[PDB]
Amino acid sequence: EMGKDYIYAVTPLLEDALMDRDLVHRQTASAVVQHMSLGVYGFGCEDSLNHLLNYVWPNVFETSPHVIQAVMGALEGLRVAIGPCRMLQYCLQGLFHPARKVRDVYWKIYNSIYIGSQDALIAHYPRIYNDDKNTYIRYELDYIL
């Protein structure tokens, strides 16, 4: 938790390292992001960590095992630090993409976010409308007192 005063100082180095041709650079930088985000939790560095999440996310389309394993761990640490709401907002883009590869990756990320913090997601799901045959609106949440 002492590392909460030093995230802004390190973010430019990590921005350079997460956009780099060498795979080991990106793997180690994702390790750094994971340990930073888990080390500061409940102290309010959501701004810095949101900025870094913007640079971590482009690496989810990675074929290399150790790199994708580092990126998933960074994403699970950022879940704890930032909230399942922001992660769900990033993930809702490609759950029903036409491309089966995009769908594979996004459902992996969503299944992580779902197994961790399943009950917090009740408040963050988006509104989906009724079609001809099926009812998809949640009405109790629309009740007003």
């Binding site: 888990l38 699970e76 640490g77 704890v80 961790g116």
Partner: protein
């Protein structure tokens, strides 16, 4: 590597560690901040397996822990974390 986790429902038995891998996290292999005590299932603590190392299987001399990061992410809430060797048999390595 033919190594998986046991992942059965853990009971009241406590995991042990040999003196090689003594202060490590049974999940992430880290040495920083041991936090939560490890429970194993009743089958993995039985007979000649009683008191062996969770990670490697050698003679145990201390208790096994989850680190603080795994506790925060709730990785202590899965099944028994004993390492199972699928490539060999019971009385094998």
């Amino acid at each position: 590597p033919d190594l998986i986790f046991c992942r059965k429902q853990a009971g009241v038995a406590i995991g042990r560690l040999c003196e090689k891998c003594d202060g490590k996290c049974v999940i992430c292999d880290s040495y920083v901040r041991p936090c939560t005590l490890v429970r194993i299932c009743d089958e993995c603590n039985y007979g000649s397996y009683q008191g062996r190392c969770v990670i490697c299987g050698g003679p145990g001399v201390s208790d096994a822990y989850y680190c603080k990061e795994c506790t925060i992410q709730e990785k202590d809430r899965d099944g028994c974390p004993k390492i199972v060797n699928l490539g060999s048999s019971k009385t094998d390595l």
